[PDB]
């Protein structure tokens, strides 16, 4: 080897310039697109807001116009995915992970329009699904598109430009450049074999996309809480006990998202009419929940700062979690385009706040603030159920700027990704791809 190694070292990090110049173009396009998705999504929540105005009087009429406004946009997405692109229902991240393995189809002429308008229906109608499912999928399909357009060849260029597009696409959904690269590295790469994915190109990819978001999204942050208090050393052990609670609930939730995918399927049984109809009752329910309990529906970002600043009661927290646990499943197990990544951030924030409130009344001598346990628990479901703690931690840190909590945050994240291992949980994005390859040869 040594001679090989001497030769391979002296020739390291030399990504083809064409791979680089073209990576800049992928993020430009994954950025403009990504921004476009989010502008659409609010604009319809707006209509739902502005339509609830014109009929704000017959209290039964209002309930249902919010039902039907989102019932209708709900169904439009279920269709545009069954009719023209089936691999674009749900998250789409399994699929892009699949494609890098060279095990799944990149149908960009079909998926880019299906996902883009599909998710607008479930995201703009008030559903429990993050912008992240569509944006990363669209981002890679975009990356495939310019590999086809300019007809560059090899495994390297196909894996680099597919990847950056998925990273520049997760950044632009959270203003999270680092947790963009760190998703490729920690979770989305072929996890059992080397790959020629150029990081230096997966980086240029996220610069351009991030810049596109800051040009349209600047001087407004998605979760703003400020600076919470510091965490003494003698209190760090509480952040382990939190991570253990996440470590055991991590899997149990994974059972429920997989299991319910199976049971919503029995409802329709693969019938595009039994199915779109079921999902406009889901979406009709979610535009109707987003008026009675804006906390039990929607992305969930709205309640996170309200959650962190200890503004809820213990009861309301108990309620909001059980409700969002439910409203999260129905939206993604139905396979409606859009992530579960974001509504888990919400789930986690809610959970930790409940945990802190206990701490505060048990230890006056620690002088605790429950919001630090929120920030610790916010990325905790992400660490414990899709098993990407390094990306989860760096994501929360990029969105809450509470770096003095970096230690209690890493300790809850390991405390989850460990206890999920010692009980019985799997990386959900490779348990999807597993079950989905388990029917591709069945």
């Amino acid at each position, epitope marked *: 080897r040594r001679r090989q190694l001497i030769r391979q070292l002296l020739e390291r990090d030399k990504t083809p310039l064409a791979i680089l110049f073209m990576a800049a173009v992928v993020g430009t396009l994954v950025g403009l697109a990504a921004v476009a998705f989010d502008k659409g999504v609010a604009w319809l929540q707006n209509q739902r807001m502005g339509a609830l105005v014109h009929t704000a009087d017959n209290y039964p009429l209002l309930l249902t116009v919010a039902f039907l406004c989102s019932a209708v946009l709900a169904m439009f997405g279920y269709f545009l995915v069954r009719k023209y692109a089936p691999e674009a229902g749900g998250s789409g991240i399994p699929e892009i992970e699949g494609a890098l393995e060279d095990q799944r189809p990149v149908r960009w002429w079909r998926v880019l329009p299906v996902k883009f308008f599909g998710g607008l229906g479930t995201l703009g109608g008030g559903m429990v699904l993050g912008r992240e499912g569509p944006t990363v999928q669209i981002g890679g399909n975009i990356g495939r598109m310019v590999l086809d357009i300019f007809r560059l060849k090899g495994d390297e260029a196909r894996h680099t430009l597919l990847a950056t597009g998925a990273a520049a696409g997760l950044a632009a959904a959270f203003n999270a450049p680092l947790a963009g690269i760190l998703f490729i590295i920690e979770e989305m790469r072929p996890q059992f074999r080397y790959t020629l994915i150029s990081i230096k190109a997966v980086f240029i990819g996220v610069i351009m996309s991030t810049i596109m978001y800051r040009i349209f999204n600047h001087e407004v942050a998605l979760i703003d809480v400020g*600076k919470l208090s510091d965490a003494p050393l*003698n209190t760090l052990w509480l952040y382990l006990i939190l991570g253990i609670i996440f470590g055991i609930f991590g899997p149990i939730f994974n059972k429920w998202v997989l299991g319910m995918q199976d049971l919503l399927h029995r409802v329709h049984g693969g019938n595009i009419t039994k199915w779109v109809l079921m999902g406009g009752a889901i979406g009709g329910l979610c535009g109707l929940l987003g008026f009675v309990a804006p906390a039990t529906s929607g992305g969930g970002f709205n309640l996170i700062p309200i959650a962190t600043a*200890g503004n809820f009661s213990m009861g309301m927290l108990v309620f909001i979690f059980v409700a969002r646990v439910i409203t999260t499943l129905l939206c993604f197990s139905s396979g409606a385009p859009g992530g579960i990544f974001a509504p888990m951030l919400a789930l986690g924030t809610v959970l930790g706040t409940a945990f802190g409130m206990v701490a*505060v009344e048990l230890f006056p*001598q620690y*002088h605790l*603030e429950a919001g630090t346990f929120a920030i610790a628990g916010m990325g905790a479901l992400l660490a414990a159920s899709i098993r990407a703690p390094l990306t989860g931690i760096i994501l929360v840190l990029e969105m809450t700027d509470n770096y003095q909590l970096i230690l209690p945050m890493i300790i809850t994240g390991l405390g989850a990704t460990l206890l999920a291992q010692f009980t019985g949980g799997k990386p959900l994005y490779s348990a999807i791809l597993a079950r989905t390859l388990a029917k591709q040869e069945a």
Partner: antibody, heavy 120, light 107 residues
Framework: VRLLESGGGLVQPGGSLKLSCAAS????????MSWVRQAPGKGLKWIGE????????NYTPSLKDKFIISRDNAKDTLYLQISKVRSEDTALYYC??????????????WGAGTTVTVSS | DIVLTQSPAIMSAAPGDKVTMTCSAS?????IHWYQQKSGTSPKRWIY???KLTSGVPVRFSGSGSGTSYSLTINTMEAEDAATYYC?????????FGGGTKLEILR
């Protein structure tokens, strides 16, 4: 860095009075402040503490509203109001700034004190 | 509430001696603190976390113990060390102070 408490003069038994502590030299917010009193020639006795958002407030052996601690980070001031006073409260009142080492908290910087006499 | 109790309420020493005072508690306490209070002065955080010296405390001071028994020790006391010292804990809310060891001098 400094703590300067005031408002300690003379009170009738059973009455009430507002003490104030005015901090300078540090970010008065993001800082637990506290109150310790000292009867003449006796030893120190914790009164109360108050976190920065005024969200948590703990006290020592008291009654219904014996003590009442406040703050107004806008003016950078600590407050305290004894009421239904008796001769036990006629002592010296310190305003302390709280902080921790390993996490077991201490009274980091103490003010200079103001004196309450409860006489006729 | 945790009751802390001082070793010698009033001790007298001649500079160049070694002087130890001892703080004892009703229940287990851990990482306690010491305040020095010279005559007509607000208490000064003198020693904290059992054994850590506040910046500007001369090395002739040291702390030690473990909850039940804690001591402060002046190793070759000096005349400026004369004060009334206080131990305080906050391993159990509410925190609670000592009763004071008053160091007197012999000259």
């Amino acid at each position: 860095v400094r703590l300067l408490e005031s408002g300690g003069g003379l009170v009738q038994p059973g009455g009430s009075l507002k003490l104030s502590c005015a901090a300078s030299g540090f970010d008065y917010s993001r800082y637990w402040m506290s109150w310790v009193r000292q009867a003449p020639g006796k030893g120190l006795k914790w009164i109360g503490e108050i976190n920065p958002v005024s969200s948590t407030i703990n006290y020592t052996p008291s009654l219904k509203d014996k003590f009442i601690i406040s703050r107004d980070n806008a003016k950078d001031t600590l407050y305290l109001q004894i009421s239904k006073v008796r001769s036990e409260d006629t002592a010296l009142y310190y305003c302390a700034r709280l902080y921790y080492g390993y996490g077991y908290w201490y009274f980091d910087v103490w003010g200079a004190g103001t004196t309450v006499t409860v006489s006729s | 509430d945790i009751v802390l109790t001082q070793s010698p309420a009033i001790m007298s020493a001649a500079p160049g001696d070694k002087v130890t005072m001892t703080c004892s508690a009703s229940s287990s306490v851990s990482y306690i603190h010491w305040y020095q209070q010279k005559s007509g002065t607000s208490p000064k955080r003198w020693i904290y976390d059992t054994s850590k010296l506040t910046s500007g405390v001369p090395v002739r001071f040291s702390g030690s113990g473990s909850g039940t028994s804690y001591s402060l020790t002046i190793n070759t006391m000096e005349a400026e060390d004369a004060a009334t010292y206080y131990c305080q804990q906050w391993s159990s809310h509410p925190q609670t102070f000592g009763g004071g060891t008053k160091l007197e001098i012999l000259r």
